[PDB]
């Protein structure tokens, strides 16, 4: 039955589809179905002493990476619509140096190693949950969501359940998903084509042009794009908005098969605003345009934004790109007129 008793989990998007070894953002929500395997015990009968050792089922997150206290349990459910929640003692182990001593000598003689901080579901009564749906083989399915912790910028993010019955562990898969490292870029030009001149001289009265380099968004994703918008507060006491221009840095496969090539114009897909009164410049792509970006397609776009240099001083720059909610700050750049 080593073999046959398989605790499970999977990482779903917002359609139910699987995405375990997808990509994720950092604002990302990770819901994890999660599955307590009682299939092999139905129809058996356990000794007394052996069900007194209880069910444990354990969620074994990377702590560096999801905030374990950002946890939304959505449902805990036997396989007959039970809602078990309030038959199992949830518990937050954040370390086990002074765990429970009864369930640190049940998870040290199981088989089983969590690392760092996890959770614990606990059967309350193990007679009666046994009896219930043990013995019923009635898994019970957990749904259950984190957030990562703001300060994880990079690296992967793993989780993996545990299963303890009778006091016998069991190892689930382990669910990987990888945390793009958003990054973004803006340099200042001579022109279009032109070398930098960052920290370099402008003459007053001449224009210049900023490139906003937009990230590339990758394939094997675990999302659609629902936004991806340049902001940009010009120092406009200094420098004053003529015009822009946004093209695709990558093709871009859309739903209907057509394809956008690499340096296509993406004017049209894209929504411009300028307050002269502020100085505030912002692009956004539309909502119904990039909902038609399929995900085993890149994208990304570049921002050329062209200014009238119209008085002396130091003169800086910088932006941030919103990726589905998460801001990107680009570096700064300056000139000196
Ligand atoms: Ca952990």
Redesign the pocket.
Known sequence: MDNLIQPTKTIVDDKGQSIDGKSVLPNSTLTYVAKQDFDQYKGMTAAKESVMKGFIYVD????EAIDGHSLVVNSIKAANGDDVTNLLEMRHVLSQDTLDDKLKALIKASGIS?????YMWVAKDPAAFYKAYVQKGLDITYNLSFKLKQDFKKGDITNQTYQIDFGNGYYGNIVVNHLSELTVHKDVFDKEGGQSINAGTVKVGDEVTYRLEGWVVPTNRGYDLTEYKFVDQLQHTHDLYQKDKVLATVDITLSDGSVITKGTDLAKYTETVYNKETGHYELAFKQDFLAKVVRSSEFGADAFVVVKRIKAGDVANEYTLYVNGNPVKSNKVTTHT
């Open positions: 074994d997150y990377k702590d969590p690392v760092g901080e996890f």
